[PDB]
């Protein structure tokens, strides 16, 4: 559960490096 | 699961963002 959080967290700061 | 839903929906949300 915490790896799957830290990709998600990891895939939101990837998706706002975009803006 | 109900996190991770809520996860899904926000990278989806930020992908559409960019079209």
Redesign the interface.
């Known amino acids: 559960d915490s790896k799957?959080?830290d990709l998600?967290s990891l895939?939101?700061e990837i998706?706002?490096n975009?803006?």
């Open positions: 799957l959080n998600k895939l939101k998706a706002n975009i803006k």
